[PDB]
C-alpha cells in the first residue's frame, strides 16, 4: 500500500548553529508529497533505499528495533546491521551468516555502541560517512503519517565506508511503519531563534517551491519570478562523412625493417582507407608517442584528408629537439616541427635494428648551415662549411667542417648514443573531406527536430532543416553577420541544409501571494508549445493558466500583451490585457465636459536619496590581516588606494545627497504653540514630543515599515536621523508657516489657509474654490491623511522604492560578503586557512588567485555601486528638485509633483530616502455641455479672457477650465477681435455689458 | 541572439503601443491636457489649440482668425515629415543609432566567442575535444575568464547604456507628461 | 551547453546571478520605461466616426 | 556637536504674514563641468609600448 | 583568527561544534576540552582619519 510523505522528513545538514535565518543547501532531501510505502507489524520485506531514506514507525510498545543496510544485503560482502532501544544504539558489520530473513528475538569486521509515538529517522551515506538523524513525537491519526512539520537531529556520524541502495527493518518477535526516498535537491530551512529547524521548502516540488527557493523565502509576494532556462534537449545525434575503400598501411609503415637519415628523411602516405589509430597508439612497437595540443585517444574521433609518415633516425639524447619551441642541430639543419604544431610524433629506441658492429655511420645529420631550415624541409648538399676567416679549401680545420656527421651506432652504445627511430605524423587535417577515418561511420539524417550533429568534423547542436541556400559547387559552409553557422551541405549527398538554432527561454512562475493561494501558472518565454493545461501566446507557451476570452486590466504582466491574475472554482487566469476601458470620448465640434466638483488627493511619492555609506578597507577585505597578502597586493600598484578613493567619493556624495535634498533650509525653523491652521490637521505630520527622536507620527509609521566586520565599515551619516528629522521638521514648519518663501530668501510667515489659496492660483483654479469650500477641503486633506495612516499601517508594501533600495544595498553587501566564501579557483576561500595550510611560493599563487578574484569582486561591487550611486544621485537631484519645486515651490510641470494639478508637498523623512505627500487637485464630477470657439455680438467675435465658453443646452456661460462656476458672459471676462465671418464655428449668443445696467439705471 | 542571448518581447505589443499612442493622441485631440489630470474632458480641436496659444503668450484669437492657414501649415508640415522620412537617412539618426549600438554590442558579444583571450582556441568545444582533464580545464578557465570578463564588459556597458536610455526614457516620460499631456513652458 | 565549464563557472559565485539580475533589472526597466512613457493614460480613448 | 544653522520660532498665526520691502540682486556663480580633456589612449601603444 | 572571545548564551544543540552569523561568518564556538560555549565578537578596528 502507498500514502503521502507530506512536508516532513527534514534534518540538520551541518553541525553549525544559525538562528532566525532561512539557510539553504543542496542535499539528499525527501521530495515533498512523494509516496511513502506503508507496512504493518505482522512484515519486513527487503526494500530499495535509493540515495537515502526517511523511515518512521508508529507504536505504543516499540516493535521496530533495528535495520540492515548495504547495496545488496547479501552477506557475500559485509552488511551493516544496527539496533536501537531508545537508551542506546548498537552497530555491527558482518558476513558470518545468521537467519536468512531476520527478526530480533523477544569477517564481522566492525562493531560500535553508544501507534501513540512516531519514532522518526533519516538514514544516508555520503562520501563514506553514514549518518542517522532522528525525532520522536506523540500522534493522534492512527492510519497515516501526521501533517504538522518537525525536524530530525543526528545520533550517529561514522566514516564506515559501506554505501547503501537497499535496506531491511528488524521486528521484535518471539503498530505500523513507513518509508520515503531522499533525492539530491536544493532545499530551504527555517532556523528559529533557538537554532532549531521549524519549516522547509522543496525547491524541486513545484513552480511555487522553485519561486520560494529563488527568493530564499517561505512567504512569496504576488508576481512573476524567473527560474531556470528551458534549454530544449536535442532528441537525436547525427554523424556524416564521405565513405572510403582501403585499410591503412600501418604494417608497411611500422613493421617493415627499413629506415633513413634525418637530413634526407623518408615519407609514406596514410590515405583512401579506413583506420584504427589505436593500432599505433596502444602498440608495443614504440617507446613514446609525443602529442602536442592533442591526446592520442582523439585520433579515432578525428578524420583526415591525408597523414604523412615523415621518418628518420637520430641518437637517443637528441630526440629532445623534436618539440615546438626547440633549437639545436637536428631542429636547426635537418627536420623541424612548427612552433604552433598540433598533432603527434612516434619515437622508439632502434638499437635493435639500426646499430651495427664497429658502429653504424650510414644514418646521418647536418652539423652546420648559413641559416636554420623551415618546418618539414629537406637539404642534401655536402660541400665544406666555413666559419673561420682562413678558407677551408676542401678539408676540415679550426672553424672549417664537412657539413654532415654520424653517431657510430654500436649495438652496445650508452642510451644517449643509441639510434632512435622517429616518425613525425605530418597531418593533412582540414575542413576538406577526409580520405581516412576511424569507426564513426554515418548515421541517418534528421530534419525539423533539434539534434546534435557532426559533418566532416564541423560539430554542434540545432534544428537541421532543408532550405533554398544554394551553395556554389566548391562552397561547403554558410554563415551570417557574426560568423555563426547558418547552412551546411552533406558530404555523401550534395543537398543543402539550414542549421536553425535550438530552443531556449526563461521558465517563469506566475503566482498570487502565498497567503491568498498556492495555485500557480508557468510561462515559457518565446518557446513553442510543441517542444514543452498548455496554451500558446506571442510571448510563448503558458502552462497551468486558464486562457480567458474576456480582458481584465493588467495584474501580473506575462509578455506581448498577456497578463495573469487569480480569479474564478478560483483559477489563475491569463488574458490579452485590457489597457483599461475603451472610453470613446463623447466628442464633437461643439461638445465640452466641464467638471462641477473636485477632490483633493494626497498621493504619496517615495524617493531614495542616500544609500548606506560604506568604506571597504581594501587591504583588510582582500587580505584578512595577512602579511603575505599585504605584500602581494602591492604588485597591483595603486589599485586598492583607487578603490578606497572610489568608495570614499561615493560616501562623501551620500552626505552631499542628503545635504542637497534636506539642507535646503538655512535655519532650523520650528512650529508654534497654537496650531491655528483653518481646519488642516497637521498634528499627524508635525513633530511628536512623546518619542526619543522628534519624528512626526507619520514619519514614525514610515520609520517602522522600512527595515559588517570583514573590513566592511558602515560609516554614519553626517546628519543623524534626528538631525534629518530636524531638517524635515524645519522644511515642513517653513512649508506650513511660510509657504514657498523660505527657499527664495528668509522664511516669510503666511497663514496656511492663505498659502493654500496661493496653491489654488498655481493650478488656474481661482482661489475662492478653496475658501468657499474651506472646511470640506480641510476634511478631504485630513481624510486623505487618515487614508495615508491607514494605508501605511495596513500596507507595509506601500514603501516599495526605499525598501527596494535598502534590499539592493543589503544584497550588494551580502554578495560582497558571501563572495569571501568563493574560491575563484584558489585552494580555499578563507585566507587565514590558506596561510595555516600553505607557505612561500605555494601560498603566493593561491593568495594571488584570491587577490585576483576578491579584487575583481570588489571592483565589480565598486563599479555597480558607482552606477547605482549615479542612479541614487539622479534620484537625489530629482528629490532636491522636488524639494525646491514641490516643497519650497509649486511646480507647473505636469505630473512632476504627483498626478492631478499639484497644490503642495510635505517632506517626511524615511530611511535612506524621502517621502513627499503631494497634495493635488483632481476634478471628480464631469458633465456634458454645448460649447463654441468664440461668440458673436455686434458682428464682433469675442473670446474668454480666462477659461472656456459653455452652455447647459439652452443658456450661455463662461467658466475656468477645471471647475464649473458658470458666470454670465461679459465684456470683462471676454476680449474682442475682428468680425464673425472668418471664425469657423462661432455661435450667435449676446455678450452682456457691465456698463449697460448702469446706462439703464 | 542565439548563444543564450535571449531577446524578450516588450510587455506592450507594437499594436498595444499603437493603441496607447492612439489613446494619447485621441485624448490630446478630443480633450487636450485634461486627460492627464483626471478623466478625458472633451473639447473641440480648434478650442484645444486655442488653449495652446495662451500657453505661449500668443493671444488665442490669432489661431481662430488664422485657423485655415494654421491647419494647412500643420498639414504641409506633416507632408514634409512624410517626405523627410521618404528620403533622408539623418531624419531618424538616434533610433537607427540605438538599434545599431545594440546590434554592435551583440555582434561584439558573439564575435568575442571567436576571440582567444590567450587560450589555444576560442571555440570551447575545441578544448573539450583535444585536451584531457586539468590542462583542458586551465584553457577553459582562460576562456571563462575572458568570456566572463567580456560578459561583465557587455553588462557593464549595457548598465551604463541603460542609464543613458533611462535618462532618455525619463526625458520621454517627461516630454509625454509636459508636451503631450500638458504644454511645457520650459524653453527649447 | 556543457558540463565541465558550467561547474568551473560556479567558483566565481554571484557574478552570474548578479549579471542575470543586472540584465533582468535592465529588462524590467525597459518595460517600466515604456509603461512610464506611453501608459500615462487610464482608459484607451478613441476618436469619433467624423 | 554641529549646528544645523540657527534655531528659529517662525512668528506664525492665522493672521500673521511677513512681506519683504527690499531685495538684493544676488549674482550667484554656478560652475558646471561640461567637457574634459579628450584623451584617446590607444590601447595598442599603451599596453604594448 | 583574532577577536574578542566571550562566554555566550546561544543554545547550541549537543552535536553542534560552531555557530555563524547571517552572512555565513564564524560568530560563536565550543571549547574542545571543557565544552564552554563562546562568542567571537570581532577584533575592534577602523580608519585613523
Ligand atoms: C505511488 O502510489 C500509487 C498508489 O496510490 C502507486 O500506484 C505508485 O506505483 C506509487 N509510486 C511510487 C514511486 O511509489
Ligand atoms: C539498551 O541496550 C544496552 C546494551 O547495548 C543495554 O545496556 C541497555 O540496558 C538497553 N536498554 C533497555 C531499555 O533495554
Ligand atoms: C573474509 O573476508 C575477506 C575480505 O575482507 C575475504 O578475503 C575472505 O575470503 C573472507 N573469508 C572467507 C572464509 O571467505
Ligand atoms: C527558546 O528557548 C527558551 C528558553 O531558553 C524558551 O522559553 C522558548 O519558548 C524557546 N522558543 C522556541 C520557539 O523554541
Ligand atoms: C557512399 O557514399 C555514396 C554517396 O557519396 C552513396 O551513394 C553510397 O550509398 C555510400 N555507401 C555506403 C555503404 O554508405
Ligand atoms: C494573511 O491572511 C490572514 C487571514 O487568513 C490575515 O490575518 C493576514 O493579515 C494576511 N497577511 C497578508 C500579508 O496577507
Ligand atoms: C509553433 O510550431 C507550430 C508548428 O509545430 C507552428 O504552426 C506555430 O506557428 C508555432 N508557434 C508560433 C507562435 O509561431
Ligand atoms: C471566445 O468566445 C466565442 C463566443 O463568444 C467563441 O466562438 C470562441 O471560440 C471563444 N474562444 C476561446 C479561445 O475561448
Ligand atoms: C454626452 O453626450 C453623448 C451624446 O451622444 C452621449 O453619448 C454620452 O454618453 C454623454 N456623456 C456624458 C458623460 O453624459
Ligand atoms: C459641426 O459638425 C457638424 C457635423 O458633425 C456639421 O453639421 C456642422 O456644420 C459643423 N459646424 C460648422 C461650423 O460647420
Author numbering:
A (entry chain A): 27 to 68, 80 to 143, 165 to 172, 186 to 245, 263 to 620, 641 to 676, 689 to 827, 854 to 1147
B (entry chain B): 854 to 1041
C (entry chain B): 745 to 794
D (entry chain C): 696 to 744
E (entry chain C): 548 to 596
Sentences copied from the publication:
Changes in the spike (S) glycoprotein in these variants are under scrutiny because the S protein has a central role in engaging the angiotensin-converting enzyme 2 (ACE2) receptor to mediate cellular entry and is a dominant target of neutralizing antibodies (nAbs) elicited by either vaccination or natural infection. The prefusion SARS-CoV-2 S trimer is composed of S1 and S2 subunits separated by a furin cleavage site.
The 3-RBD-down states were ~43% of the total population, with the rest of the particles constituting “open” states, including ~47% 1-RBD-up, ~7.5% 2-RBD-up, and ~2.3% of the M1 spike. Thus, we observed a modest decrease in the 3-RBD-down state from ~56% that we had reported for the D614G spike, and the appearance of open states (2-RBD-up and M1) that were not observed for the S-GSAS-D614G dataset. The variation in the S2 region was unexpected because the S2 subunit had appeared relatively invariant in prior studies. Structural analysis revealed destabilization of the 3-RBD-down state and loss of tight regulation of its conformation in the mink-associated ΔFV spike.
